[PDB]
Structures are given as C-alpha cells and as structure tokens.
Curated annotation (Swiss-Prot), chains A, B, C, D, E, F:
InterPro entries: T4-gp15_tss, T4-gp15_tss_sf. It comes from Enterobacteria phage T4. This is Tail completion protein gp15. Keywords: Late protein, Virion. It is found in: Virion.
Length: 211, 211, 211, 211, 211, 211
C-alpha cells in the first residue's frame, strides 16, 4: 500500500534512521534509565496539532501519561531543487533535498543531550555512502552528502512547558524514475555517523506512526 | 468557439500533454489498480474554489466519490516576458512563459509517485523539438527549452486532508501574431520526455474541464 | 475645454491609438463575428469602480447588456522621469513615461487573442517615428522608443468572473513647455505596428469616455 | 514675528517663488480665462486636513466656491543632510535639502498644464545663481543646484474627485549660523527658469496662508 | 545617588552641554525676548509621555502655562558598539555611541532658528578635544569626533500642534572600567562649537529634570 | 538530574560565570552599599513572564520587596552553527554559539555601572583559555573567543518603570559527542576578564533559579 522503491521514501527513511538511535539519560533512585527518542515523519503543522492532542489533559490517567510523550523528534521534507554541479536512471539525476528535523523536549537537559548527539557529526557536512542493489545485480554506489544548514531555537509556554529546536539539513542525493515494486524490491545499505555499514530498515520500522 | 491557432493555447496544451499521462499505482485485494491523474487548466484560486466545492460531502454517494477526486493536477500560466538573448512571424519572437503545475493529493505516497515521474527529466532543463506545420507547407522547427525553476510544498488540514506541491516551470518559447483559423488549422507535433514524437492533441483532449 | 497641444495628451493618445484597433473573433451560429476592443484613459482605481458599477446586475435588460461590456482595455500614466542617456523646446527634453495597459476579459480566449495581437511587436522594444508640425513649418522628427517592461496576471471571481492582465510600457519620448492652442494646433503623425504612417486622431476619437 | 534671515526660510521661499508664477488656461464661452495656481508651505498631512475642510459641502454658498479651491500646490521640506563633495559662515557649509512639491487638481488637463510648465526645466537638474547681500557689502554668490529626484502619481475619489501628483526635489544649497535681523536684513536675488534675475520676494507674498 | 565618574554619564553630559546654550529670538511689542531651549535626557517614549502630561490643560492656570513648555530638546542614547579602527583603561577602548537629539517646537520659525544653530557645525563631523584629569595627575586627552548621521522630520497635529525634528549623532569616544567616585572625582573640560574651552558642568546643571 | 558533562551546559556556565561577579554601588546615609547583580539562565520570554509575576504589586509586603528584584541579568542561548574556519571528539568540532545577555534595571545609573563593567573587555573580542580535564587525565586546552556582536536598548513603562539593554555574544567554541557522567566528571578552569584562572563553578552556583 505504498510505492516501496520510491526515491523520496528512501531519503526519508535514511534521514530518519540516522536519527533513530538517540537516547537520553534520566537518573532514578534505583538507577539510570536510558530512554529512546521516538521519531515521526509528518508535515510540521500536522505533527504539532496531533502533539497538542496527545499533551491534552482529559482525565486522571492522562496526568501521568503526559511525560512519556516528550521528548520526540519530527521529520519532514520541506524543499527540493536540481543540484547544479543517453537516458536518465543510474546514470541518475543529482537532486538536492531539504529536511526539517524538529526536536521537542520538556527539559533543556533533554535537548542538550539529544543535540549533542547530533551536532558534532556535521562539519558542516557529513558524508554517507549508500548502496542500492536491484534484485541481484551489482549494487549501485551513491555518494550522499548531508549538510547542516541552520538551527532555530524556540519555545511555547503555559505556566512549563515545551522546548523546540529545529535543524535544517541539505541532502545532496539522487533522483530517477520509479522502478516498479513488481520488478523487485530494492536492497539498501548505508554508512552511519561512525562509518558503520547498517542496512536501511523498512519505513514502517523507523518512524512511529502519528496516525 | 476558440482561437485554435492561438500561441498561448498551444503552449498550454503542450505543457498539459507532457504531464497528461501520469499514473499512480494503488495496491488492492484483487490486484494492483493503476489510476490516471486528471489534469486541468485554470487559475489556481479558481481551481481551489471549485475543489472545495467538490470536496464537500453533500449526500451519501459523495462520501465515497471523494477519493476519486484526488489526486489531480492543475496547470496555469502565471507570468511571461520577452526573452532577451524585418516584420514578425516565423521569423517569430523569443518569448518566455512561466507555468505553475499544481499537484494535489490525499496521500504522501501518491505525491511521491507522481513527482518521481516528473522531476528527473529536468536537469534543470528539458529540451523538446516542436514542429508546427501550416496547412500543407513545410513545418517550422521551434526549439523549446523547459526549465524547472522551483518547487513549493504545502498542506491544508481538517482532522486528513490534502497535500499540495507546486512546480514552477520556465518555457522558453516562441510568439507571433494570430494566424486566423480560416487560413487553416496548425498541425503540431513534439518530442516527449523520451524523445518520442507524439503529435499535440486538441485542447479538449488533454484537460478535463473545471467547468 | 482642454489644452490640445499638451505633450502628455499627445503621448496618451499615441499609446491609446496603437492599441485602438484590436478585434477579437467570436464564432456565432450565423457566422464569425468580429468585435473591437474599446479603450479608455483613466486612473485604474476609477476605471474598476465604474466597471463594477456597470457589471453589477441591477436588472434584466442588464443581464444581456453585461457581456457587451467586456472585453476592454484601460490605459493610464503611472510614472515619469528625466531620461538620462540654448533654451528648452525643440531642442526638447528627453523624458521617460510609464504606462499601465490593463486588459479585462470574461474569457481566457479573448485575452489570448488580444495579447497575441500586442506582445510580438515588443522585442522588447517597438520603435515609432513621430512627426509634429507646428502650423505650417517643417514638422519635427521625434524618435519614440516604447519598451515592454513587464506583465502581470490576475483574476476577480464570483461563481465566473473576470480575467485581468496588465502590461507595463516604458515610452522614451520628449517634453517641452506648453505651446498655446492659440499659436496654432499641432499636426501629429506616426508609424504604427506595421510602420504605416497614420496621423494621430483627436483624443475624443481614440478613447471611449469613462464619464 | 519670524527670523527674517533664516536660511531655511530663504530656501523655502526661493523654491516657492520659482513655482509661484504658473497659470492654467481655462476656456469659457465669453473667452479664455487664465488662472494662477496658489502655493502654500505646510506639512503635507496638515495641508490635506485643511483641504478636506475647505472642499466639504456645508452649504450652497459653498457649492460654487469649491472649484476656486483647486488647483493648488503645497510645498514642504521633508529631509536634509550634509552634502559630502577657519570658522563657519561664508565660507559656509554645503547642505542638501529635500522638498516635496504637491500638485492637486480636479482635472487631468489642469495637471498636464502645470507639470508641462515644470518638468522640462529639470534635466535632471536646474541651476540658479543666487545673490545674497548683507546690508551694503558685496553680495555673496551662491550657486544653487536643484535636482528633480522622482515623481509620484495618485488619486482620492468620491463618485469626481481629486488628482494628486507630487514632485521630489533635491536643492544643493548652503547653510550657516543665524545672522540676526538686527544686524540688517538680507537682500536676495536669483535666476528663474529663464535666467531672468528676479529678486526674492518676502515670504508673505509668495505663499498663501494655510492658516 | 549616582556613579559620578560614569563614562556613559560623561558622554551624555558632554552632548547635553554642547546643546545646552541655544536660544531663540521671539519678537515682542516691548522688545525682543530671547528664550533658552531647555534640554532633557530621557527615553523618547518617556519624554513624550511626560510632554503630553505637561501640555494637558486640566485647569485655567494651565491655559497660559502651557505655551511655555515648547520649545524643548530631548536627548538620549539609542545605540553603541565597538569602534573598529596591555590591560584596559587609559589606554582605553574605542567605543562608538549613538545619540538621538529631538527638537520639539510649536512654530516652524522656532525650529528654523534652533536647527540653524546646530546644523552648520557638523561637516559632517565636529571635532572636540576632551580633557579628563584624575585627582591631580596629568589630564588625559581623549579625541572625540561627533558625526551628524541623519535627520528626521515629523508632526503631531490637533486642529496646531507640534513639530518634531530629530538629529542622529555618532560620537566616536572612549570607554574603560568604572573608576570609583571614592578614588576621587574626575575633572573634565572640552572644546565647544567655537573651540572655546569650557569645562564639563555636573549633570544636574545641564538637563532639566524630566522627573 | 542533569547531564553534568553536557557541552551546552558548560558554555552556559562559562558565560554566566564571567558575568557572575558584577556589583553596583548604591549610596546610603550609613555608607555605600555594594549589591551583586543576580543572573538567570532562561529563554527570554520565560524570564520576562516570571519577572512580570514578581513585579506585580499585590500587597504591602510586596511594595518594598520591589527594588530587590532589579537589577538583574538573564542569559540565554539563541543560535548556533558550525564554525567554518579520524573520528570526532577531542579532536572536536569548531562550533559557534550565540548568547543574549539581558540586563534589566530600574535606574539608568544601575545600567551605566553594570555595562561599564562589561563593555570595555570586548574589543570587539575577548579571549579565554579553558582547561577541561577528564577524571585525572592530562587536561584539554580549548581556546575560546567570545565576540561582542551588537547591543540593543529598550524600555517598558508605567508612570517608572524598567530599563532593558541586551548584549549579543558570539562564543567561538568546541562541540563533541556526550561523554557519560559515569565515565568520570569533567574538571573545568578558565581565565576571567583579568586573566585570572578561576575554576568553573557548578551550574547550581552561578544561576539563581527562575523556578
């Protein structure tokens, strides 16, 4: 029920999965608890609407169930353009994609931990080699440059309430016409922030559903 | 009831027809269904008005027939200017025309499919050779450069509701004074995204009528 | 009841008259009908007010009489400045005058026809030699460059309603102090869009009255 | 009841007087009537307030007296700055003064007449030699350059009503500390638009009082 | 009740005092009256509040009293920044300070007089040597350049009412850490608009209290 | 209950502590009283809301306790970016951090005293060498350049009421991935405005709690 080999989907999942494995430390009496930051893919307005819905105190079980919601990260595509350096598709087209990575947090410390886990890997760019194999052929080698373009710090108060920092990223990637899922599912690998060659998980696995 | 040989009409139809034959795959229980994206030519404000009129659930048969409406594409001219590099018409005038191609979709996946079918052919430009023959004379050969200028991503929510992406295109074309339909209908051919020589269909054939 | 030899008047009429003789083809049951596009000289705000007064369906004999109103063209001066390349007047002062030519239309087709009759003659400029003779002396030869600067496309809806495209033109002309109508009326000729030497008609002849 | 030798006052009067002597022809049956355009010096907002006060139909004795009010010209200073090319005053300081000259008119024809009498003398500048004599000493020779910087066209409707064009002028003049009226009144002459050496009239003669 | 040796205070007082001694001539029947223009140091908003408070007619004794309030001058610091050309304080730090000098007046004539007394001494700059002696040591010589940056003309009406012109000045001065008033009071002299060496009056002497 | 070795935290504390020790002189009859200006770390809006909560005169016990609140300083991070001049962390990444230092005060004199204690040490930059030791290893030497970028002056009145000046600072520092507190606590020293090597106090000591 979705175009599996979509190039946009692959870039969405790649970006999401780079930021999928981020935890914050939270000290308890019995001991330190490390919690994973759940990440979604959605238009920002959408996400924020639904976030205002979850954070709403409707009953007594909600009062507690409120601090499990934050911290979180929302991801979205916000712009793209041709990337000015016989047919077209591997050899493919140099495209350039703009992503907003929106971190939301109830505690400045939460934010500090998270961003400290992101920010140092972009100087200002972070390279990743991606391998996309078609059926059983030799995989393709796509050089992917991800550039940290800017950051934006903001709040939204009520008495605490909610800290929001947004990073903007430029992916220098590759576009080509759709290759039907029926012609075979694309196998994809990439190098993470430590040059560790992870293989790209399916979409359904990286993003929690806002729905 | 229209000036058939209109230069503007030909550019509207040319653009509309390049993007006329775009389908999205939609996986069903019985098997995959492929649906064509219907295309219109209209002022954007107009299109959106009539679209809000259609999207309104008036009766029970409308509730279903709503997701037959989307996806669609609306096309319009939004600007033109002289294209700065004895009488005038073949030799004609280098003109430059600005088109807004507006894709509306209920599902991110629909969008991904469509744009992946448009975007790779503009690097940033796409050439097409056009042949316009007058009655039975030797056809004229007009070199047409179409350049992808920018993209713009947006929403418009209600609880799903509607994704809207707009591509802006610069057509580098040719203008000349009207040649009366009474002097004979122009025969028009062109090269598509695959250098395949289709001949330009009548207006009534490419655009579904917003009316 | 007006300064006949007014320099501004002469430019208003010249511009008005270049665009005075434009017809659109309108296919009927009995056969093709050609209708002339009527031109007025007025402040834009004004013109649109009176146009909203005329187009308002107050009654039934109006219901029909509404589609005789459109299409039309309103012309106006909007800016002027010294034209940086013993006393003053022939030898006169190089002035530069800015005109807004506003085309209004109920049908996209009407617009296409009209503008296709304007646009090809400005690449980006259109020359005209003007001859202004004083009484019976040797006429003066003023070289007039008219440059097409920009275009602007708009609507104004209600259920159709009205298409509005405005061209902006830079006339590079000549200014001098007023020469009394009592010293004799100035004779003026010019070369039209086909370099055919028409002579400049009186104001009352070119523009229908907005009043 | 005012500092007669005021430098600001002198420039205000020079400017007003260059534009003091302007008439429009107004054709009647009995014969042509020439009317002088009255000029005032006032903040623009002020002038327009009082002008809305005069033009209001309070009675029938007012109804006639309305078309004697327009046309008029309001003049005002709107900016000044040092003019970047032992003590201070002749030798004096190069200053630069900015004037808004505002023409108001009930008929486009009136405007054409007035502005046609102003505009051709600024190409883009108009020089005037000014002679300022102290008591009986040798007059000082101040070269004054007046530059037409821009023009601005506007209306203000009610059913006719009122045309407003504003010229902006850069006077390149001279400033020095105040020379008391008790030390003797300055004698001032200048060259008009025709190099005719008029001598600068007292303020009260050039400007009608808005008060 | 204040840090007497404050560097900011010294610059505020220096500026205030250059403009402390400005009078306007006011011709009366009995004879000419010269009135000194009172100067305050305050935030512009503040000053205007209190000015509206003074100018308000609450009783009959106010009616007369009210027309003595204008003319006046309000002064304030509005910006500062480092002034780009072993420890720090004589040798001290080149700072640059921005002052708004705001002249308010009921009569154009009053304004003309005042500004004619300010404006000519800035071409565009006015130099002044300042001497700050510590206890009994050799005085320090600080070169102070004051530059006239821009001017701004405005009104505020009611039936007269009030003229407001503002000069903006860049003082190129010197900052250093605070030298306690207990370590001895700094003695300060400077050169006025005529290179005449006045010594800096205490704050309380230059500015009338807005409080 | 916070990531002690957080880099953002260290820079917040470094900045806060350079400005931790600022006093103003306040003359009493019994003798001069020196009061330390308290510093907080908070988003500006937050600080201002809570400041409006403290400044509200609710009772008589509140009326006195008003002038103990001011003066104060609020500090916050407002922007950051890569600082464009085998793995990453000491060797670490050149980052650039933007801080808004907001000084609030009831008296101009208070402001003058404070800012005079800050401003002279930034010409436009101030260097500090920081030593960060991990457990017991050899310290790291991070060169920290703090640049004064701009200042901004404002009020907020009610009859006095409150002066607000804001300095903006560019810290040219260093980022690296989080080093767990469990791996040992970081020891930090730095050179203050006088090259005095103080050691960085814990967060809890520098900032008063806004909560």
């Amino acid at each position: 029920g979705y175009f599996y080999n979509s190039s946009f989907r692959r870039y969405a999942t790649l970006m999401g999965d780079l930021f999928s494995n981020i935890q914050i430390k939270r000290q308890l009496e019995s001991g330190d608890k490390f919690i994973r930051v759940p990440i979604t893919y959605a238009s920002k307005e959408h996400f924020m609407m639904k976030l205002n819905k979850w954070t709403s105190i409707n009953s007594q079980e909600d009062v507690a169930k409120v601090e499990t919601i934050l911290p979180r990260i929302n991801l979205h595509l916000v712009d793209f353009s041709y990337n000015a350096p016989v047919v077209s598709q591997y050899n493919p087209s140099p495209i350039k994609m703009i992503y907003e990575l929106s971190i939301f947090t109830r505690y400045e410390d939460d934010m500090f931990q998270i961003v400290e886990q992101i920010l140092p890997y972009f100087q200002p760019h972070f390279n990743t080699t991606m391998y996309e194999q078609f059926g059983n052929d030799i995989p393709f080698k796509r050089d992917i440059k991800i550039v940290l373009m800017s950051a934006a710090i903001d709040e939204a108060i009520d008495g605490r309430r909610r800290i929001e920092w947004s990073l903007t990223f430029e992916v220098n990637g590759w576009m080509y016409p759709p290759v039907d899922d029926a012609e075979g599912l694309i196998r994809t690998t990439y190098t993470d922030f430590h040059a560790n060659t992870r293989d790209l998980p399916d979409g359904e696995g990286v993003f929690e559903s806002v729905d």
